[PDB]
Amino acid sequence: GQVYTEAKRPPGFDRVRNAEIGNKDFELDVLEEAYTTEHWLVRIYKVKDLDNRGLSRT
Amino acid sequence: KISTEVGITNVDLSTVDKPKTTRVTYPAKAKGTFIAFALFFQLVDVNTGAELTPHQTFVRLHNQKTGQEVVFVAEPDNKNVYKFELDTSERKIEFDSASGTYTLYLIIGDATLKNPILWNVADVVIKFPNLFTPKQEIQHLFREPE
Amino acid sequence: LEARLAHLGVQVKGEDEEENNLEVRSGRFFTVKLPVALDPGAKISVIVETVYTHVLHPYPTQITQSEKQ
């Protein structure tokens, strides 16, 4: 919800569904990013390992 | 900073009626069995008539069979008389498992007293309703040829 | 750096190059045959040029996306 996909549209627009995104900003708890192709056509994430200190998250 | 005996007037065990009452002195393991229950307290200093709130006024329930111990704090009432009540329907999280017999220890500690009591009063009956050790062996069950 | 040498070439001031034979006589010393023999008191500008490879290591081994190696 930051990229300007279209000339005159709200920042964070979706071309395929012609609608703005709802969850503008969030942080993936378990899936750290690993790669995202130039056109954002295929995104590859990577499941994080179990937390070292044994905390509930990650 | 003068220390005096904690003392006890009347440990009154009154079973809850879903209300008969019994009374027992400080050095007297209450005879009988109580099934649910609120008990009456009366703390008073000696050598001078003076009810003195001690810093620690607990009520410990001990499960001899399972080893779990739950501690309940006691609150002074308007009559300067602590009262401990067990609903038998509330506190599901507090009492997950039901045990037929529970030890009902009494703990009263204070910074400026010289008689920390731990004597259990009686038995309570409540009817409200690992990885480190090696695991059990598993053996595959082979198929049978025709 | 003996086990890292890339091409090592010798020269003489002006348009010339020399042959550096590789022999053992230990750091694999290179024998260079001067084009013109020099008598005592002579001077010969030998522009020795070498190139070392794989000799630069990044001290911070794991930089993030935005750091200078």
């Binding site: - | 410990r60 609150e75 695991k135 059990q136 | -």
Partner: protein, 361 residues
């Protein structure tokens, strides 16, 4: 094991004198000790993505500014990089120490709250009955973490804590007596106290998934030269009066355990093959006898001797264990032979040896 170089923080430099015996013992094992003032500016645990000090020790309650590079986040990264951290706290914990405790799953009590006991406080308290005399009865009962000898009552004068019930890793090396509640010294209780019962650990310790031992010690006063050389006698009328506290043995045992000295297990080369062969063949056929052999070592004073390994369990698992047998010791190798299960597919030999007070495998 880990590197000898250890960095020790101090509230004031005058602690080394008061803590002379324990530091000397800690230096018997060849450790290189660098003492830094808690508030020293040039305090750098990490530099250019490489840790300088292999182990960290903290003896500084009443701190709120660790220094240049020492942060709770940096300490968490350290513990994630295999470092071993030892801490202490005496009624002056401070917000950074509480944050670091919370990260590992141990809920330190309030700043001014000290564990209290009325039934069992020795005659040397001289004041509020807070000189807890932790008996040997309630203990971890392990051979590596708390040693193997016999101990006398251990004097404790500190702030209690409570383990988080979400953490499986957290192990309670000690627990307070059934009367210890750990609340404010002189204040009435109108709400449930912190760790009112047997949950006031006071020597709680961690064991990370990557084998980074951490030992959140209740009280700094526990390591005091006075406590090491003092006599113990509970104030209960007519209790025994031991001439020696028995604290030194426990302190030395916990120090050795936290520095990967007493218990460490390393997994050597593994080998699996058909019965009667010498090399692991690709794609074992269904219902084919298979033999598995794995060497294990124990690190006894650095000798790396073979582990006794009574109960090590091999699991042949696809998504859930199809086979689970006991490896049999034979000439230093743990070897077992078993027919492969009828079901085909991919499988996983998965020797897992997780035991209390040992390394994970």
């Amino acid at each position: 094991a880990s590197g000898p170089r250890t960095l020790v923080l101090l509230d004031n430099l005058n602690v080394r004198e008061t803590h002379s015996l324990f530091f000397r013992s800690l230096k018997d094992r060849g450790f290189e000790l660098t003492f830094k003032t808690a508030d020293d500016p040039s305090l750098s645990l990490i530099k250019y993505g490489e840790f300088l000090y292999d182990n960290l020790i903290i003896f500084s309650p009443s701190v709120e500014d660790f220094g240049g590079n020492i942060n709770v986040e940096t300490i968490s990264a350290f513990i994630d990089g295999g470092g071993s951290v030892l801490v202490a706290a005496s009624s002056d914990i401070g917000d950074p120490l509480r944050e670091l405790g919370s990260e590992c799953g141990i809920e330190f009590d309030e700043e001014k709250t000290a564990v209290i006991d009325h039934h069992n406080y020795d005659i040397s308290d001289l004041g509020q009955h807070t000189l807890i005399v932790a008996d040997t009865e309630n203990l971890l009962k392990a051979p590596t973490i708390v040693g193997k000898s016999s101990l006398n009552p251990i004097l404790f004068r500190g702030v209690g804590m409570v383990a988080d019930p979400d953490n499986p890793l957290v192990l309670d090396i000690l627990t307070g007596s059934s009367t210890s509640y750990s609340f404010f010294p002189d204040k009435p209780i109108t709400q449930y106290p912190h760790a009112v019962g047997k949950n006031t650990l006071l020597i709680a310790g961690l064991q990370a998934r990557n084998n980074a031992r951490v030992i959140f010690s209740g009280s700094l006063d526990f390591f005091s030269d006075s406590f090491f050389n003092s006599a113990v006698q509970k104030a209960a009328p007519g209790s025994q009066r031991y001439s020696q506290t028995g604290n030194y043995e426990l302190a030395v045992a916990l120090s050795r355990w936290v520095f990967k000295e007493e218990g460490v297990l390393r997994v050597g080369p593994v080998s699996h093959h058909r019965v009667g062969e010498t090399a692991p063949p690709n794609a074992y056929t269904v219902t084919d006898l298979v033999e598995y052999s794995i060497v294990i070592q124990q690190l006894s004073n650095g000798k790396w001797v073979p582990f006794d390994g009574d109960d090590i369990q091999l699991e042949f698992v696809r998504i859930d264990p199809f086979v689970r047998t006991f490896l049999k010791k034979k000439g230093g190798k743990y070897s077992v032979q078993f027919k492969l299960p009828d079901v085909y597919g991919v499988f996983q030999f998965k020797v897992d040896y997780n035991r209390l007070g040992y390394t994970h495998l």
